[PDB]
Amino acid sequence: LLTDYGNASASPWMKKLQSVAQGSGETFRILQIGDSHTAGDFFTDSLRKRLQKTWGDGGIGWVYPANVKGQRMAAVRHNGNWQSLTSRNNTGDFPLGGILAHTGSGGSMTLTASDGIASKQRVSLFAKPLLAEQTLTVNGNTVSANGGGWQVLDTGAALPLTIHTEMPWDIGFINIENPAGGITVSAMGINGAQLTQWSKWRADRMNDLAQTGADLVILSYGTNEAFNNNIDIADTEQKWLDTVRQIRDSLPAAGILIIGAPESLKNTLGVCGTRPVRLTEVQQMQRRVARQGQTMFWSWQNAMGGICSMKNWLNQGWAAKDGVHFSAKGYRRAAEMLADSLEELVRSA
Known part of the structure; x- marks a missing residue:
């Protein structure tokens, strides 16, 4: 589920998390910026209560x-x-x-x-x-x-x-x-937002990012990009790459984790489908950006059972009636798989 396209175990942030786990007494700051899944706080709060029990309430x-x-x-x-x-x-x-x-x-x-x-x-x-x-x-x-x-x-x-x-x-x-x-998980979501829509923010936004003191930035978008049937992948990929490059410029010591969009359905009509037309291009792009930018990539879709799984999650009360947003216990399920992956990565150093 979690692919590291960089060098997690050698990273400065890895070393900081390790140090915190022995109780260096420093604060390890996780900042998740993203769309509605972030804005609801169910994913991030589940993630928070788990990584805080594991490594400390920061x-x-x-x-x-x-x-x-x-x-x-x-x-x-x-x-x-x-x-x-x-x-x-x-x-x-x-x-x-x-x-x-x-x-x-x-x-x-x-x-x-x-x-x-x-x-x-x-x-x-x-x-x-x-x-x-x-x-x-x-x-x-x-x-x-x-x-x-x-x-x-x-x-x-x-x-x-x-x-x-x-x-x-x-x-x-x-x-x-x-x-x-100890650990903090901060949720900076906007309902419906796309990653490129940081442009709506003030020009010095990266100077703000540096001040957050984040040690790990979790970028979670892709759902609404995928809903633009006329999105231009190549250009989007460039702007995404540029955002990774800028996060690295003003947070030289942080990890970056890119969470690929989960499966969403344009229609819950019919067994399985129907996915948005551009969902797969977006999903694939997100992975390319992760590897080129040498970031961590966590596949939310693979965490769900891969393709044609949103219908399963819908049927199991894990997902909302619309086939895009999750249930509170649906998000808790997702975030726990991610926390799993993270602790797995840490333990392996």
Whole structure:
């Protein structure tokens, strides 16, 4: 299921994960960026709870600044007055990930962890203040910008977290990491997104990517590319290759895992089919990019039983009625196979 077209065992990130597994106390950061399967958080949260039991709870990682309509965070509940906006249907000066929230004046947001937390955690925010040296507060502590523009505010707090803004700010993702180290899985999804649609994000998005501190980037797209009957594979392959090349430029020390689209059905009509017309070209392309870019490739379709399997998963309650999206227990099944593959790769070093 997992093919390594690079050199996993020799990699700097491998060495970091190993070090964390003995309890170096560092944080190993997994950042999954992708479409609806990522945006729902069922895949990533299942992945999170497993790799955290295996190698340590590093915290929730990077989460939304506010509720995002039709999208989901599993590790935090949001309660407040900020208004989110995403690159899905809209234009905006987006930080990496396509999500921001307007705090407005006298704004307020509380993040409460679905489980237990206790102590001070490391907190980091993508933020952009209206005025240059502006402030907000985090559990009552004044936290200050330096100059204007998008930037990362480094602070510390315990959960639950309350962020007060007297005057307007735009807030991106928020990082929340356990100081004792371990693993974080961060879900940066947009419903319906394609990998090339990072272009909708601000020009410095890669400078944001470098700041996420990710040690392993999981790129999970392909489903909606496959739904464009008129997609141009060669050009798409170039832009995909360019994205891999740029991730490597600004995250020189990270692993890259490309998850090939799972089987989707244009029609659940008839036993087996019918697949989208361009699904196989897309799937194949994703593997070519993985090998040329020397990345890891995990075949979601092969994890399902290969071709003509989505109908099986549909019948078994693993997939949603539409034949594209999965059920919550369907995603848990997929992600667990991936976690399997990962631990398998690690143990073999």
